[PDB]
Amino acid sequence: VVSSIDELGADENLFEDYVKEKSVPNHVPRHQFGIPYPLKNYFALVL
């Protein structure tokens, strides 16, 4: 991690790319085809 973007105050678009599991058939429906995946949101603490 060397840049972290504020995944916050973004609220139906944030977890909205994930939604692809649409128009672009070139995102093999994630599920259905039972395909692996990476998560794009990691936790952290701050001060």
């Binding site: 058939p25 070139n26 093999v28 085809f33 395909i35």
Partner: protein
Amino acid sequence: IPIPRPITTPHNNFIIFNKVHRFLTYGLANVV
């Protein structure tokens, strides 16, 4: 008073075959 004459129609049968192949697939890209 006895009966004499005997005959008949068909004659069926069976048989089988055994084979053992070796095949292979490959982790083909799950793409469009």
